[PDB]
């Protein structure tokens, strides 16, 4: 298992514009298009993102390409972030995948706000971090995915994904 396969399980793949769990226009493998209610604003962003007139639909390769950019940006955002970097540097390979996943879903800003959990992760207090991570809107809104990520943090293994 690796970050790509992990996120592909959590996000799914859709070749036509769809609405995410929050109701926003998304396409491919969790690629957020816009927070705007307009389907046209969404089609516009999509065409801009792909470099062609897509009429709201893309092929697998296009979805994969977006996904490759998005993971890359997630990692780079973590490395550029003063609060996230030290956490990431301190973690083992599996757990790093768990942080990348949160970042991809919720953005650098949002993860960076989990101040207390971040401090627990850095200290390697697994069980406590898992408890603290659960007291969040994140966990209440997408409990199955949150549980998988949290288990990854607690255990340091890919069990929740097998
Ligand atoms: Cl883009
Ligand atoms: Cl869920």
From Swiss-Prot:
This protein's record includes keyword Hydrolase: yes
Any single Gene Ontology cellular-component annotation: host cell cytoplasm
Known catalytic reactions: Hydrolysis of (1->4)-beta-linkages between N-acetylmuramic acid and N-acetyl-D-glucosamine residues in a peptidoglycan and between N-acetyl-D-glucosamine residues in chitodextrins
Reported impact of residue 132 to M/F: 2-fold decrease in enzymatic activity
EC number of this enzyme: 3.2.1.17
Family matches, as InterPro entries: Endolysin_T4_type, Glyco_hydro_24, Lysozyme-like_dom_sf, Lysozyme_dom_sf, Phage_lysozyme-like, T4-type_lysozyme
Induction of expression: Expressed late in the viral replication.
GO biological process: cell wall macromolecule catabolic process; defense response to bacterium; peptidoglycan catabolic process; viral release from host cell by cytolysis
GO molecular function term, any single one: lysozyme activity
Effect seen on changing residue 132 to I: 5-fold decrease in enzymatic activity
EC class: hydrolase
Protein family according to the UniProt entry: Belongs to the glycosyl hydrolase 24 family.
Name of protein: Endolysin
Gene field: E
């Amino acid at each position: 298992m690796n970050i790509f396969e992990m996120l592909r399980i959590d996000e799914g793949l859709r070749l036509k514009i769809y609405k995410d769990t929050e109701g926003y226009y998304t396409i491919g493998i969790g690629h957020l298009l816009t927070k705007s209610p307009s389907l046209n604003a969404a089609k516009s962003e999509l065409d801009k993102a792909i470099g062609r007139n897509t009429n709201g639909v893309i092929v697998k390769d296009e979805a994969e390409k977006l996904f490759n950019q998005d993971v890359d940006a997630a990692v780079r955002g973590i490395l550029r972030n003063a609060k996230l970097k030290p956490v990431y540097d301190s973690l083992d390979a599996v757990r790093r995948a768990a942080l990348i996943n949160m970042v991809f879903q919720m953005g650098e800003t949002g993860v960076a706000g989990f101040t207390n959990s971040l401090r627990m992760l850095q200290q390697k207090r697994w069980d406590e971090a898992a408890v603290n991570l659960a007291k969040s809107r994140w966990y209440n809104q997408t409990p199955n995915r949150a549980k998988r990520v949290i288990t990854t943090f607690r255990t340091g293994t890919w069990d929740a994904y097998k």
